[PDB]
Amino acid sequence: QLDPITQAYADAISSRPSLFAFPLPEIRDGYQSSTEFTTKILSLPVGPTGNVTAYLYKPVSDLLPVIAYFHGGGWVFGGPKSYRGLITNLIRESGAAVFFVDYTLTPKVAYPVPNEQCYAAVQWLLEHGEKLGVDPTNMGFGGDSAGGELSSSVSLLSIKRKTPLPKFQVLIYPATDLACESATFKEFPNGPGLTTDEIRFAASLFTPDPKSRLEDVASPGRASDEDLAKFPETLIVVAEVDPIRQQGEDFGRRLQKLGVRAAIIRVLGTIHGFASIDVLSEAPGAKATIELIGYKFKKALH
Amino acid sequence: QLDPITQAYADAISSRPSLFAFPLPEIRDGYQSSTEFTTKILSLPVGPTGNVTAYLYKPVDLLPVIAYFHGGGWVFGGPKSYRGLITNLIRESGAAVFFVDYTLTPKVAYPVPNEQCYAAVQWLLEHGEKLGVDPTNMGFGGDSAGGELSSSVSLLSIKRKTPLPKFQVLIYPATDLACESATFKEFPNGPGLTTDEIRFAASLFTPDPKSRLEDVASPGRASDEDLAKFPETLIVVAEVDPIRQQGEDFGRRLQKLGVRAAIIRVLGTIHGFASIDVLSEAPGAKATIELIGYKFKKALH
Numbered sequence: 001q002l003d004p005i006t007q008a009y010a011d012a013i014s015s016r017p018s019l020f021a022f023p024l025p026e027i028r029d030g031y032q033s034s035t036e037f038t039t040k041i042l043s044l045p046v047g048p049t050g051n052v053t054a055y056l057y058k059p060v061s062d063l064l065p066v067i068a069y070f071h072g073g074g075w076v077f078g079g080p081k082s083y084r085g086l087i088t089n090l091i092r093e094s095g096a097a098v099f100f101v102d103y104t105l106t107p108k109v110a111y112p113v114p115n116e117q118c119y120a121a122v123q124w125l126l127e128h129g130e131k132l133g134v135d136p137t138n139m140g141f142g143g144d145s146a147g148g149e150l151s152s153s154v155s156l157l158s159i160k161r162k163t164p165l166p167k168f169q170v171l172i173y174p175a176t177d178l179a180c181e182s183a184t185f186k187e188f189p190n191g192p193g194l195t196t197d198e199i200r201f202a203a204s205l206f207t208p209d210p211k212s213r214l215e216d217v218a219s220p221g222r223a224s225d226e227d228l229a230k231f232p233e234t235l236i237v238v239a240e241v242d243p244i245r246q247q248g249e250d251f252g253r254r255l256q257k258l259g260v261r262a263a264i265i266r267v268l269g270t271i272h273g274f275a276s277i278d279v280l281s282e283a284p285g286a287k288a289t290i291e292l293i294g295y296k297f298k299k300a301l302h
Numbered sequence: 303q304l305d306p307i308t309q310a311y312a313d314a315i316s317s318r319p320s321l322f323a324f325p326l327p328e329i330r331d332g333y334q335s336s337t338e339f340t341t342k343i344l345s346l347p348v349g350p351t352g353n354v355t356a357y358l359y360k361p362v363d364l365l366p367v368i369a370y371f372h373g374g375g376w377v378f379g380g381p382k383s384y385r386g387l388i389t390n391l392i393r394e395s396g397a398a399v400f401f402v403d404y405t406l407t408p409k410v411a412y413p414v415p416n417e418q419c420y421a422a423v424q425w426l427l428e429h430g431e432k433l434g435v436d437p438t439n440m441g442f443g444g445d446s447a448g449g450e451l452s453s454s455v456s457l458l459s460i461k462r463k464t465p466l467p468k469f470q471v472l473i474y475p476a477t478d479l480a481c482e483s484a485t486f487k488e489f490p491n492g493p494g495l496t497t498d499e500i501r502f503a504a505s506l507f508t509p510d511p512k513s514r515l516e517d518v519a520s521p522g523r524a525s526d527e528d529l530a531k532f533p534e535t536l537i538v539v540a541e542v543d544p545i546r547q548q549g550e551d552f553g554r555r556l557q558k559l560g561v562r563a564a565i566i567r568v569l570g571t572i573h574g575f576a577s578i579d580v581l582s583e584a585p586g587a588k589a590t591i592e593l594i595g596y597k598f599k600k601a602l603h
């Protein structure tokens with residue numbers, strides 16, 4: 001069922017204790033190990049905590065299109081280092097700038113603070129982007145896993161507050177419903193790459209109050225028909241062997257029914273994380289869909 | 303379950319009788335109704351009938367070239383009905399397309415279309431350079447019945463030790479003409495392609511069920527040793543499609559045998575989405591059509 005490269009990776013980490021457990025490391029972001037880009041480090045004096053860290057990445061040589069990217073890692077891990085591979089791929093394929101939001105990780109904060117940090121950073125980009133050489137009117141959203149929850153959350157908050165939506169949104173195996181368990185939870189309870197236990201752990205740090213999980217801002221899969229019908233055109237990519245697979249597909253079908261242009265693609269033989277884990281990302285299906293994502297940002301953002 | 307555009311297409315034709323029935327339409331290929339590429343009509347003195355017609359399309363040193371084998375149940379299709387997909391492929395891939403206009407059933411039957419396609423490829427390999435294309439940078443593409451033909455030509459290349467393409471794309475392919483698979487039961491008349499249409503096509507192409515067991519007819523049933531030598535392959539499949547299982551199983555089989563094989567399922571769409579003009583503009587269809595072209599572009603150099 002799994003392709004050899006993905007199977008080899010799964011075998012190599014079956015031996016590893018899960019990192020989603022106490023005590024948490026104090027380093028939450030690190031490198032996993034040809035396209036060049038510039039980096040501007042931004043401390044934005046905005047949002048619930050008074051600061052949001054953002055990195056603006058631009059390809060080398062009028063206004064560049066820009067992808068606001070919200071990284072995954074279960075709201076506990078990740079940052080510019082661990083996502084360097086995906087950011088590079090996005091920049092190589094899309095030709096766009098990447099606005100990478102380095103929001104505060106759990107449990108230093110909890111829902112809805114990372115959501116509002118991401119939302120506030122986007123509002124800043126909208127106002128000041130032109131001065132950094134990007135075109136805020138040509139904006140994409142991207143997010144993977146927990147970042148997919150954040151991407152769709154920020155979209156929903158934009159709809160609620162009547163602030164600009166991106167032209168195009170990509171959700172990669174997104175978490176869309178933190179409250180309910182879906183069919184694939186049962187099908188792949190610890191099926192490699194992501195286990196039901198890791199999911200519960202991440203959800204307990206990000207939304208310690210289970211009642212929070214029912215809110216549409218936490219779980220955009222539970223948003224109203226009226227709000228979701230206003231979503232930007234969206235591409236959803238899911239891994240086949242993945243407890244969280246059902247959430248993305250159901251969310252996409254829901255967008256389709258409501259008249260949003262939404263494409264949904266299932267990649268066979270791969271697992272959660274294939275877009276950001278270097279080893280997984282070189283397998284045929286993963287590699288193909290990663291360049292599709294970048295290619296589709298290139299086509300949508302002009 | 304289907305996206306609005308695809309659902310509307312399915313509804314608009316739900317009252318129409320299947321075209322896979324007698325009497326057959328007298329036109330077997332027509333426009334669904336070029337300035338982006340040139341067209342050269344080639345009469346190749348090859349194959350069991352002594353002729354194979356091929357169209358060489360070139361976009362605006364040597365061009366990469368995609369040998370394309372069209373679908374239509376072996377009974378229908380040709381350059382006219384595939385004008386939209388070919389146009390898309392050329393735009394997105396930037397490659398030339400060698401479109402094999404093989405003889406349709408039942409004027410001929412298996413294995414003549416297979417052998418026509420194989421022989422047209424051998425001609426391209428020998429003469430491509432003088433046509434301004436690079437035979438060492440070749441792709442295979444095929445949809446549905448054409449996916450049977452594409453994987454059949456690959457299998458024949460291996461058996462006969464002739465050059466393989468660098469990259470192969472199978473779009474909702476038929477890979478096994480002998481067996482009914484799980485999705486036959488799940489979508490027996492699920493729109494776009496029905497189980498009756500499947501058995502109808504097979505009755506003209508392979509009237510003798512024993513032919514269907516042959517690996518050349520059904521590459522999904524080829525030996526491990528042959529399949530392990532397949533070129534790098536991307537398989538794209540529609541979700542609501544009786545034949546969905548065949549493409550997915552074939553890909554899993556290539557993956558296990560150590561061939562680099564990607565398999566992608568497009569949700570909310572049906573058989574034929576890559577060549578039917580209306581279906582091809584829906585989000586999922588459109589994305590995967592550009593994916594296909596885009597990956598030919600990246601693979602062919």
Ligand SMILES: COCCOCCOCCOc1ccc(C(C)(C)CC(C)(C)C)cc1
Binds near residue numbers: 376448504
């Ligand atoms: C009159 O002009 C019509 C020609 O265009 C129709 C064909 O193009 C769309 C593809 O439709 C099909 C439908 C069925 C099939 C077959 C029957 C080959 C599927 C199979 C082998 C799984 C039975 C192939 C293509």
